[PDB]
Every structure is written in C-alpha cells, then in structure tokens.
C-alpha cells in the first residue's frame, strides 16, 4: 500500500542515486526494510534513496 513520511530535517543529495529534500516534505516509499529507502517526494516530484532517520511516519 501507500507508505508516507514527512522530513524532519533538510537532506542534500550527495550520491548519484539519493534524493534531496527539505524539512516538511511529504515522501512516499516506492517498503521500509533497512535504513535507506527508495522514495518519491510528493512535494517536488523527484525520487531517490533517502535515510530513514531523517523522516517520520505521516498518514
């Protein structure tokens, strides 16, 4: 199903495959095994891996 999170802190992309996002962005997982998740930003429309410890669940 849909699994969504909100960013607690800004994250700047530093690799070829991760995703930059800002505090407050809504992100969905494209599941939550592990610490790095493939995500899509509902805010920005971009995608990439995000660190799970920068985000928190959001209905």
């Amino acid at each position: 199903g849909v699994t969504t999170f909100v960013a607690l802190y800004d994250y700047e992309s530093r690799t070829e495959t991760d995703l930059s996002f800002k505090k407050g962005e809504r992100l969905q997982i494209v599941n939550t095994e592990g610490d790095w998740w493939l995500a899509h930003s509902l805010t920005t429309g971009q995608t990439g891996y995000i660190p799970s410890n920068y985000v928190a669940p959001s209905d």
Side-chain angles (χ1 to χ4, degrees), residues 1-30 32 34-59:
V2 164
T3 315
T4 36
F5 295 89
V6 57
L8 305 174
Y9 324 114
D10 295 350
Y11 176 79
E12 199 206 12
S13 160
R14 292 307 192 85
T15 76
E16 301 293 342
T17 59
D18 65 354
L19 164 63
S20 296
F21 53 85
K22 300 290 183 50
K23 177 164 190 180
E25 275 190 41
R26 299 243 308 151
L27 306 149
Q28 84 180 308
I29 309 312
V30 192
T32 50
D35 290 335
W36 283 89
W37 303 333
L38 194 63
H40 165 247
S41 173
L42 299 183
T43 302
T44 74
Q46 310 297 308
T47 76
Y49 292 99
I50 65 171
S52 67
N53 51 10
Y54 277 62
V55 306
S58 173
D59 294 329

